From Swiss-Prot:
Tissue: Expressed in placenta, heart, lung, kidney, spleen, ovary and testis, as well as fetal brain and liver and hematopoietic cell lines, but not in adult brain, liver, pancreas, salivary gland, or skeletal muscle. Present in lymphocytes (at protein level).
Source taxon at top rank: Eukaryota
Task of the protein: E3 ubiquitin-protein ligase which accepts ubiquitin from specific E2 ubiquitin-conjugating enzymes, and transfers it to substrates, generally promoting their degradation by the proteasome. Negatively regulates TCR (T-cell receptor), BCR (B-cell receptor) and FCER1 (high affinity immunoglobulin epsilon receptor) signal transduction pathways. In naive T-cells, inhibits VAV1 activation upon TCR engagement and imposes a requirement for CD28 costimulation for proliferation and IL-2 production.
Originating organism: Homo sapiens (Human)
Location of this chain's protein in the cell: Cytoplasm
Residues given in the record as 4-O-phospho-L-tyrosine binding sites: R249
Binding site for Ca(2+): D184, T186, N188, Y190, E195
Name of this chain's protein: E3 ubiquitin-protein ligase CBL-B
Segments for region (EF-hand-like): 131-203
Post-translational modification: Phosphorylated on tyrosine and serine residues upon TCR or BCR activation, and upon various types of cell stimulation. Auto-ubiquitinated upon EGF-mediated cell activation or upon T-cell costimulation by CD28; which promotes proteasomal degradation.
């Protein structure tokens, strides 16, 4: 990666501006709903400008431009922006078909940008690098990170996987790639300490984390990945005559937290945020109470 000096950061700004203009095409009919690329990219520009304002002399800019996380961040922001641009150039009119694979790929990129914004705000809070001081929520997960990586803010996927393998083995390439897509929110082949904190919060406890991840995010019909509150209500409408139908999902606005949606006996659709217990225990309890019976409306309800 190149040094993340001012010129390189400004080059990234110009690419992000082109993505914004591409996404303002009136034929796109883009809905103001998270992740909303037309808010995320300006917000990213604003936070990057804040960072530069905190590193406002030659020696400070030197430190910033050679910070390993920041160099990787800017390189990855530039690559995803070029990808977005290329998507429009190759998609042509297919970009305006709402359910085309091209538009689906735009939605994927909008999610990636949303995650990248959350990451940079977590690592440079108020524009100052704090990655070496980042506090991992789960103490046992924190001990793994510190043992193998110390105060590092970011690690290549290959290195991360090799260390994780020492604690939880992974033999399947399919499993490894699925795990990478869960952990590596920014899809840049690096695991940040922020991405590690989100993963270990969601799939706690740490001692069984691969089992928990498999049970919830791999082999569970109820798992819907990232959805908005409105999208949960809309998807569960078709199950409104099957009380006990339920799904669980992630919020791109509040990373690291699960939400559940279910159909009541009356046919109403309710949503709830489980607290102070791992999701799989909240599903166990909700099933034994008769609320969570049919994940995605299906008749097979996994048991843990
Ligand atoms: C993984 O997801 C999480 C995780 C944590 C939170 C979440 C969400 C929802 C999201 O991110 O999707 O959300 C908020 C939170 C803190 C503040 C906050 O905003 C200022 C919210 C947003 C909120 O409460 N919503 C309520 C809403 C949403 C849900 N539900 O998604 O499960 C349940 C609700 O109550 C049971 C609820 O409140 C409406 C009501 O009670 O009638 N309704 C309608 C809305 O339209 C929004 C979405 C916390 C608590 C930190
Ligand atoms: Ca990443
Ligand atoms: Mg803003």
């Amino acid at each position: 990666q190149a040094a993340a000096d001012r010129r390189t950061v400004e080059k990234t700004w110009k690419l992000m501006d082109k993505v914004v203009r591409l996404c303002q095409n009136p034929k796109l009919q883009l809905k103001n709903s998270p992740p909303y690329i037309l808010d995320i990219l300006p917000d990213t520009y604003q936070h990057l400008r804040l960072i530069l304002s905190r590193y406002d002399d030659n020696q400070k800019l030197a430190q910033l431009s050679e910070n390993e996380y920041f160099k990787i961040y800017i390189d990855s922001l530039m690559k995803k922006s070029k990808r977005a641009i290329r998507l429009f150039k190759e998609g042509k009119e297919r970009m305006y078909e709402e359910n085309s694979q091209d538009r689906r790929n735009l939605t994927k990129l909008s999610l990636i940008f949303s995650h990248m914004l959350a990451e940079i705000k977590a690592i440079f809070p108020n524009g100052q690098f704090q990655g070496d001081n980042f506090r991992i929520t789960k103490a046992d997960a924190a001990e793994f990170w510190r043992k193998f990586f110390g105060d590092k803010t970011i690690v290549p996927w290959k290195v991360f996987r090799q260390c994780l393998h020492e604690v939880h083995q992974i033999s399947s390439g399919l499993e490894a790639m699925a795990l990478k897509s869960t952990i590596d929110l920014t899809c840049n082949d690096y695991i940040s300490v922020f991405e590690f904190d989100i993963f270990t919060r969601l799939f706690q406890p740490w001692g069984s984390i691969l089992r928990n991840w498999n049970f919830l995010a791999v082999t569970h019909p109820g798992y819907m990945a990232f959805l908005t509150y409105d999208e949960v209500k809309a998807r569960l409408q078709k199950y409104s005559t099957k009380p006990g139908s339920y799904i669980f999902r992630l919020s791109c606005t509040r990373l690291g937290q699960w939400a559940i949606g279910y159909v009541t006996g009356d046919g109403n659709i309710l949503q709830t945020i489980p607290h102070n217990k791992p999701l799989f225990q909240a599903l166990i309890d909700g099933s034994r109470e008769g609320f969570y019976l049919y994940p995605d409306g299906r008749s097979y309800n996994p048991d843990l």
